[PDB]
Write a protein that binds this ligand. Structure first.
Ligand SMILES: CC(=O)N[C@@H]1[C@@H](O)[C@H](O[C@@H]2O[C@H](CO)[C@H](O)[C@H](O[C@@H]3O[C@H](CO)[C@@H](O[C@@H]4O[C@H](CO[C@]5(C(=O)O)C[C@H](O)[C@@H](NC(C)=O)[C@H]([C@H](O)[C@H](O)CO)O5)[C@H](O)[C@H](O)[C@H]4O)[C@H](O)[C@H]3NC(C)=O)[C@H]2O)[C@@H](CO)O[C@H]1O
Ligand SMILES: CC(=O)N[C@@H]1[C@@H](O)[C@H](O[C@@H]2O[C@H](CO)[C@H](O)[C@H](O[C@@H]3O[C@H](CO)[C@@H](O[C@@H]4O[C@H](CO[C@]5(C(=O)O)C[C@H](O)[C@@H](NC(C)=O)[C@H]([C@H](O)[C@H](O)CO)O5)[C@H](O)[C@H](O)[C@H]4O)[C@H](O)[C@H]3NC(C)=O)[C@H]2O)[C@@H](CO)O[C@H]1O
Ligand SMILES: CC(=O)N[C@@H]1[C@@H](O)[C@H](O[C@@H]2O[C@H](CO)[C@H](O)[C@H](O[C@@H]3O[C@H](CO)[C@@H](O[C@@H]4O[C@H](CO[C@]5(C(=O)O)C[C@H](O)[C@@H](NC(C)=O)[C@H]([C@H](O)[C@H](O)CO)O5)[C@H](O)[C@H](O)[C@H]4O)[C@H](O)[C@H]3NC(C)=O)[C@H]2O)[C@@H](CO)O[C@H]1O
Ligand SMILES: *[C@@H]1O[C@H](CO)[C@@H](O[C@@H]2O[C@H](CO)[C@@H](O[C@@H]3O[C@H](CO[C@H]4O[C@H](CO)[C@@H](O)[C@H](O)[C@@H]4O)[C@@H](O)[C@H](O[C@H]4O[C@H](CO)[C@@H](O)[C@H](O)[C@@H]4O)[C@@H]3O)[C@H](O)[C@H]2NC(C)=O)[C@H](O)[C@H]1NC(C)=O
Ligand SMILES: *[C@@H]1O[C@H](CO)[C@@H](O[C@@H]2O[C@H](CO)[C@@H](O[C@@H]3O[C@H](CO[C@H]4O[C@H](CO)[C@@H](O)[C@H](O)[C@@H]4O)[C@@H](O)[C@H](O[C@H]4O[C@H](CO)[C@@H](O)[C@H](O)[C@@H]4O)[C@@H]3O)[C@H](O)[C@H]2NC(C)=O)[C@H](O)[C@H]1NC(C)=O
Ligand SMILES: *[C@@H]1O[C@H](CO)[C@@H](O[C@@H]2O[C@H](CO)[C@@H](O[C@@H]3O[C@H](CO[C@H]4O[C@H](CO)[C@@H](O)[C@H](O)[C@@H]4O)[C@@H](O)[C@H](O[C@H]4O[C@H](CO)[C@@H](O)[C@H](O)[C@@H]4O)[C@@H]3O)[C@H](O)[C@H]2NC(C)=O)[C@H](O)[C@H]1NC(C)=O
Ligand SMILES: *[C@@H]1O[C@H](CO)[C@@H](O[C@@H]2O[C@H](CO)[C@@H](O[C@@H]3O[C@H](CO[C@H]4O[C@H](CO)[C@@H](O)[C@H](O)[C@@H]4O)[C@@H](O)[C@H](O[C@H]4O[C@H](CO)[C@@H](O)[C@H](O)[C@@H]4O)[C@@H]3O)[C@H](O)[C@H]2NC(C)=O)[C@H](O)[C@H]1NC(C)=O
Ligand SMILES: *[C@@H]1O[C@H](CO)[C@@H](O[C@@H]2O[C@H](CO)[C@@H](O[C@@H]3O[C@H](CO[C@H]4O[C@H](CO)[C@@H](O)[C@H](O)[C@@H]4O)[C@@H](O)[C@H](O[C@H]4O[C@H](CO)[C@@H](O)[C@H](O)[C@@H]4O)[C@@H]3O)[C@H](O)[C@H]2NC(C)=O)[C@H](O)[C@H]1NC(C)=O
Ligand SMILES: *[C@@H]1O[C@H](CO)[C@@H](O[C@@H]2O[C@H](CO)[C@@H](O[C@@H]3O[C@H](CO[C@H]4O[C@H](CO)[C@@H](O)[C@H](O)[C@@H]4O)[C@@H](O)[C@H](O[C@H]4O[C@H](CO)[C@@H](O)[C@H](O)[C@@H]4O)[C@@H]3O)[C@H](O)[C@H]2NC(C)=O)[C@H](O)[C@H]1NC(C)=O
Lengths: 172, 317, 317, 172, 317, 172
């Protein structure tokens, strides 16, 4: 990806996360768990659904057209009829495969971005209470029980509550 | 002890390969095929009105080939021509055959109204053993073979006005006798002349006497022509022989009708899109089944598969 | 106390909705329409040279219909044909009418040079009451109706060399008498023959005697044909009757000229692009006004609006 | 946006900024003000103007072409003339609406990027003298009068001048 | 003291300007041209089989113009017609000349098989001084000029069946005598009739007597026609004069063959793509050399250069 | 670029780096050197090679087609033959120049991204032992000999080894 998160500083994905596209895995004094993030998952799904709504069920009605198969040799007009249809098919074949290649490149990049967006949001929440371990994980320098972990996932975490404890642990 | 919080994404054990701008083989969590590659092998008779020609070409059903009598006055959204179709009447050809087939197909009807022309001094209802109807020599239902009466052929001059509110399609023709003797045996002179005209058009045909190879023991030939008469216009036939006269007119409509060559059977189902291979689903925007389509159809491309990625890059554990 | 520094962007209370790849309704600060949807309702006479045909078709102005005498030797960049136009001379048709109309339109001129052919033994200047010029029976200005003189029609054999440095366009034709008696009354024999030829082309027409419906009390018809003579080539007319002779040639140019059917009035303004609806601005790259265009024109599309975002996403307070 | 600033970690835009597309709002001992940023605004406008110069006033000259309306039925050649024009219009209609959708997606993303670029430039300027509050705003941990604020907007701010004061306030 | 670690990228002193979506002049470290702008000025004779027509048109080599005798039974992938080519036999024209040239070009062969028709009561091998072969009056090699024998012309009725497994191409024609006297001098009557037919086709031609300008002192003309006979079908010629008879048939194949007008010389090299300017490399996907191409060719565009950036933005020190 | 590194917070490129597209320049007690980064250089080259493999040597075979030059005036059918070819050329000319403009915009942006990816990877490696100087350079707050510099370029650098020394130097 062009943002460097998916297949980047995150080494791999979680096959065990079946209820979300992005989420958190934690490790505290009460154990280790996994939870999906709603906003980032919906943002990626909404964008992909916007692409599908443009392409699925959007066909064009054509009725009487020109002949496109010929049993006998005729000449000038038949050559043009064949040339017109071959020209049209090549242009639409170009349109179709270029469209898929462009959209797939964008789809991979927008899903990479949502992952990077969620990591940055979490990092800003923790302020000086955590440090980036480089692999998508944060080292949290204070006791963060389950309620403290949920407060980060719910965007209600107050860094000021644990700042003195965290700054003390960080600077030994 | 502290805590560790890891940010991450999902993955699947069974990913799909897709093409991108920078990489032609990249695995994503999920994709969807954008190219319809299959048909059900039959032509659904809904929502489009399908008319199976079976043994009859549309042109044969137009003229009145005996095996096509069941097609009289039929309408259609899609006329299906079978490759098994064959002519079985007087041997004929149509100059610019494809244009007449196209105009009748797009009109979508064989609605025919009989008309009384003043063929006063001629023998009507000429028949032949090449056109057998009910174990008896016959002719095209919509055409009127005129021959001499009392060994004389009077120069015809007949009028037919268009007082309707629609255009009229008249199908007529010229007979090409195989020998100079047949031209005497049928029309009592060696020089046939034909001049079909309106206020907006003129057509003139001269017979071409000569031997053609025999079809159903007939070395003669008919050449079919057509004329369109606008509202307020008038048809005017002026001939001294060899005229295959019209018995009336067809209504020429305008709509969504067309014609398709196909050997696929007709089925009891619903599908907006029809190809000669049969009906195809039209949820996908592209298809490589057939360049010939009818209805709300995916566009034909020459790729067998184009997978649109519907998920992120797949990085399994 | 410290300080707080906030980074941010602008917003507007009145945003515009645009389409994107992932969302078909998204608000941006500003957009611009890329599809021209309107015309001024008139055709600007600048910068293109407009020739209003008014009551005359281009073909009628070519032959010399009396109401089109003011169009003699005129040039144009765009010839405008009105739907009210009507023919008012001898009844005629042109085999492949559209090709002659196209070649004269793209040439962009009616510049005509009179020439003296050797019509020694025939009666020139045949006229008719169907073609009235100055309250008097007349004929097409550029055509020469030849009939018998002293009840004899001598087999014509006339030459005209092209010693110019440009191609010549000769307009000629054949008369189709309504009856076999008229063919005697006009050309003193029943068999007319025509053979117009050069070193690069040959054309042969036989009249088709017969009754057509009457237009201005004329059951006869004329069929117009044309011939192109290259520099160094020679025109050669060889006929024994029914020949509508040329009085000269037209210069065939090559340039930007064309023809357009339109009922929009001509106005005093400037616009590079012309449509049958009238002139349109050409600042935008697309338009849905008309698929028929002339000049530097936006490309025709079938979308009524395509807004290009010219600002960021709008997030108001 | 794919960068997550506009309609992202910045909650909304400023309707009161009419002289620039991106800028600063501050709060110090001398009051609170607003100022636009020249470089980032010009970068976005230049990119959009580059798109307009490709599309505005770039029409093609066509003179004598084929007929496109028909009063009477003819046949084979007229069918091809209609089919050619219908084929051409569908391809250009596809080109036109795909072009706008692609450019609008890119325009939203490039304007989102310039906003993110300016935030990152400001963050790097402050070094250890400020902390990210998460909503596009910086908490500056020293007395920063109007001249100090202008020095950040003019890229003349020296972090070393206020470092000892800032580090002291940050680590109580 | 510490340390300083700087992250950076490379740059070059000689960058390349490319176009982008937001900027039409931007410098990158390296680019590659996607539009082929030049040819080698000659047509490589590999891998496509090139047949140089030199002084002969493909149609002249088909009929049997004496200077084209070396082209008998030749095959080709690309027939190259030179602008210097000229006809040098009996003066002729072909109605729908381009269609016959196209069908012979795409077939890719002049393989001819002689056949014995029953021209019992006529004089075969008619010759002329306009068609000189070996300092002697001659005729088209593949055509058989039939004239009267003992001042009588018997009505011909000849058959030729197609018992092969391929279609047959028969080239025949009609003679147009310059005067009514020549029509007597050659065919002993004033009315020639021709009717070439199969079970699937009929063709009828009447001569058109009249004077055309002289080419090699010949005011007469020949009009060439062709007929295709399917397997199991039968050719049937029925004529009373003016018939330019076929001496046999050509095999009509189907493949990759075509024809190209070009004055570029043929060279000893290899190139998949051929243009009238000469062969071009086909590594690039686009080219502005010529819209006329043959083989695996880059697509023609109207841009002279389109540089694809192959490196980052260039920011030199 | 849309990521703001190349021609962004990095003032210019290094003409003297001929063995790589991205790399490091350092300054320690043992001197100053330059070294290229393999992974980021290969990532950009692989992506560009993927574009070239789609465009180079991928031509279409066409043999018998329609005539495209005409010496004499004919009429209706010749007008259509010319109109068909002119229509086709305009569409492919549009396809070609739009393709190059889009790919060049993407190529500049993907090379800008790889530069940003490498900077972020290096920053995360150093943790609290270095600070961002804002111009793509890191101020390292401990003695980092040549072996220490190679450990950063080889992704074997342990921040814990120098943390106490670095934190002490950073907070005077
Ligand atoms: C009182 C008296 O004596 N009066 C005289 C009359 O005798 C004379 O009449 C003519 O006499 C000659 C003498 O040989 C001849 O019999 C004429 O009849 C034609 O005969 C030929 C040869 O048998 C025949 O050709 C054969 O046709 C069949 C197929 O026949 C039909 C068909 O297609 O089924 C029969 C149809 O009725 C007929 N259609 C019409 C409208 O008449 C068609 C049509 O004739 C052909 O299709 C035209 O191509 O044919 C088969 O094809 C054989 O191979 C073929 O040899 C003709 O069909 C007969 N013609 C007719 C009209 O029946 C007979 O008229 C009179 C005039 O000379 O003179 C009096 O004085
Ligand atoms: C000394 C002596 O006695 N000499 C003999 C001559 O009498 C004789 O001349 C012919 O005599 C017959 C006798 O009935 C007849 O009058 C011939 O004249 C034709 O008459 C018919 C019937 O009236 C007429 O047809 C009418 O035409 C009008 C419209 O007329 C014009 C027109 O279009 O305005 C008049 C134009 O001058 C004329 N153009 C030319 C170039 O001549 C055209 C043209 O004839 C038609 O347009 C052709 O379609 O017609 C209206 O349409 C009526 O409905 C229609 O009935 C013909 O037009 C008359 N023909 C001519 C040439 O005027 C008369 O020639 C001579 C020959 O038989 O024998 C001598 O011995
Ligand atoms: C025993 C007896 O007395 N029998 C009688 C015969 O005399 C008589 O025969 C005819 O007599 C007349 C008398 O004037 C005349 O000579 C007939 O011959 C024609 O002559 C004209 C004029 O010289 C000539 O036209 C000239 O043609 C040349 C070029 O000539 C060729 C050519 O193209 O090279 C020669 C070819 O052999 C010939 N091809 C064929 C198949 O015959 C062609 C062809 O004739 C033309 O190309 C047709 O357009 O011509 C040059 O072009 C001059 O400009 C031109 O004037 C004709 O070519 C001669 N015709 C023939 C067939 O040779 C002669 O037949 C007999 C019949 O009337 O009556 C007996 O009782
Ligand atoms: C120009 O030249 C062509 C040459 O073909 C002439 O056309 C032919 O004309 C003859 C009659 O003159 C036609 O012959 C007829 O064909 C039928 C043949 O049937 C038998 O043979 C076929 C296989 O060839 C078998 O399938 C079939 O079962 C039969 O065994 C016959 O039906 C005809 O009459 C037969 O029956 C009657 C009644 O018993 C007998 O009187 C006859 O002797 C014969 O047995 C007849 O034989 C031939 O078909 C024509 N061919 C073509 C291609 O048209 C043209 O006539 C000539 N031009 C002019 C002006 O004459
Ligand atoms: C469209 O339709 C019209 C008719 O509706 C056709 O026009 C008719 O066609 C012919 C044209 O040649 C005309 O008939 C001819 O009559 C002539 C004989 O004149 C008779 O009448 C006069 C009157 O005074 C008498 O003096 C004379 O004695 C005749 O009684 C001859 O040229 C021909 O007649 C032949 O047969 C008769 C009968 O056997 C013989 O007695 C004659 O000697 C001669 O051999 C010829 O039949 C007819 O008059 C035309 N009508 C009109 C109104 O003009 C068109 O031809 C037709 N067009 C097409 C394209 O089909
Ligand atoms: C083949 O068949 C067609 C059949 O239509 C023949 O063509 C017709 O020929 C007749 C003459 O034979 C033409 O009749 C002429 O029409 C005019 C009619 O005008 C009156 O009627 C109309 C409405 O129908 C009104 O609008 C108008 O105001 C009039 O009330 C007349 O102008 C003609 O002559 C009239 O005036 C003179 C002078 O006073 C009188 O002598 C006449 O009696 C008459 O009053 C004449 O009546 C008719 O128009 C033709 N129709 C068509 C469609 O062409 C062909 O002639 C025939 N073929 C052959 C060879 O004859
Ligand atoms: C292109 O133009 C040329 C002329 O420029 C045309 O060719 C002329 O057309 C005809 C062809 O049939 C020729 O005229 C004919 O003359 C014959 C009579 O011969 C006369 O001369 C001889 C000379 O010895 C005398 O012996 C004889 O007695 C005659 O005096 C006849 O076939 C015809 O004449 C008829 O009318 C006359 C006059 O009334 C009667 O006396 C006759 O008995 C007969 O009934 C016929 O008119 C003429 O000679 C040709 N010229 C040349 C140079 O060949 C082309 O036909 C033309 N082509 C086209 C397509 O239009
Ligand atoms: C309809 O009208 C056309 C008018 O062109 C007639 O066609 C012309 O017919 C004449 C014969 O009647 C042709 O004349 C022949 O042309 C040749 C000319 O050669 C000389 O002149 C040219 C330049 O014009 C020089 O390049 C050349 O070197 C010569 O100086 C001659 O070869 C012919 O005969 C000559 O030689 C013989 C033998 O010595 C002499 O008997 C002659 O007098 C003459 O010297 C002859 O002169 C002319 O070319 C034709 N032109 C065209 C365009 O075809 C049609 O014939 C006429 N229709 C009918 C039916 O007659
Ligand atoms: C395709 O090919 C066939 C032949 O293969 C052609 O058909 C032949 O063409 C003509 C048609 O007109 C026929 O020939 C004619 O013969 C008639 C004379 O009949 C003779 O035989 C009878 C038999 O009882 C005798 O009573 C009589 O006295 C004759 O001996 C006349 O109409 C013509 O003959 C002329 O010349 C002769 C000889 O000089 C004179 O004696 C006559 O008086 C007259 O002036 C004419 O020649 C022939 O019979 C046809 N054959 C068949 C089988 O039908 C087709 O025409 C041809 N088609 C094309 C398009 O080319």
């Amino acid at each position: 990806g062009i943002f460097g998160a998916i297949a980047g500083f995150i080494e791999n994905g979680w096959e065990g996360m079946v209820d979300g596209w992005y989420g958190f895995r934690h490790q505290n004094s009460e154990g280790r768990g996994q939870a999906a993030d709603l906003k980032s998952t919906q943002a990626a799904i909404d964008q992909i659904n916007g692409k599908l709504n443009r392409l699925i069920g959007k066909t064009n009605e054509k009725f009487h057209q020109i002949e496109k198969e010929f049993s006998e040799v005729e000449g000038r007009v038949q050559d043009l009829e064949k040339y017109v249809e071959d020209t049209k098919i090549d242009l639409w074949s170009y349109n179709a495969e270029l469209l898929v290649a462009l959209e797939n490149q964008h789809t991979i990049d927008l899903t990479d971005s949502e992952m990077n967006k969620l990591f940055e949001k979490t990092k800003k929440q923790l302020r000086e209470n955590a440090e980036d371990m480089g692999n998508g994980c944060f080292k949290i320098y204070h006791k963060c029980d389950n309620a403290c972990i949920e407060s980060i996932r719910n965007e209600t975490y107050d860094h000021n509550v644990y700042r003195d404890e965290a700054l003390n642990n960080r600077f030994q | 002890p502290g805590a560790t919080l890891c940010l991450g994404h999902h993955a699947v054990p069974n990913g799909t390969i897709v093409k991108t701008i920078t990489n032609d083989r990249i695995e994503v969590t999920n994709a969807t095929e954008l190219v319809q590659n299959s048909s059900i092998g039959e032509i659904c008779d809904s929502p489009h009105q399908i008319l199976d020609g079976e043994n009859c070409t549309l042109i044969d059903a137009l003229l009145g080939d005996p095996q096509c009598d069941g097609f009289q006055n039929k309408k259609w959204d899609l006329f299906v021509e079978r490759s098994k179709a064959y002519s079985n009447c007087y041997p004929y050809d149509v100059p610019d055959y494809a244009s007449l087939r196209s105009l009748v197909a797009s009109s979508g009807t064989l609605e025919f109204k009989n008309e009384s022309f003043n063929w006063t001094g001629v023998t009507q209802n000429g028949k032949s053993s090449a056109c057998i109807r009910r174990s008896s020599s016959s002719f095209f239902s919509r055409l009127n073979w005129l021959t001499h009466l009392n060994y004389t052929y009077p120069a015809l001059n007949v009028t037919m006005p268009n007082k309707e509110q629609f255009d009229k399609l008249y199908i007529w023709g010229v007979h090409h006798p195989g020998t100079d003797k047949d031209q005497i045996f049928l029309y009592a002179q060696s020089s046939g002349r034909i001049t079909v005209s309106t206020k907006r058009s003129q057509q003139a045909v001269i017979p071409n006497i000569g031997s053609r190879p025999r079809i159903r023991d007939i070395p003669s030939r008919i050449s079919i022509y057509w004329t369109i008469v606008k509202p307020g216009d008038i048809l005017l036939i002026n001939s001294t022989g060899n005229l295959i006269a019209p018995r009336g007119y067809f209504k020429i409509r305008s709509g969504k009708s067309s014609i398709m060559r196909s050997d696929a059977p007709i089925g009891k189902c619903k599908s907006e899109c029809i190809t000669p291979n049969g009906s195809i689903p039209n949820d996908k925007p592209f298809q490589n089944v057939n360049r010939i389509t009818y209805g709300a159809c995916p566009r034909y491309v020459k790729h067998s598969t184009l997978k649109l990625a519907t998920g992120m890059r797949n990085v399994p554990e």
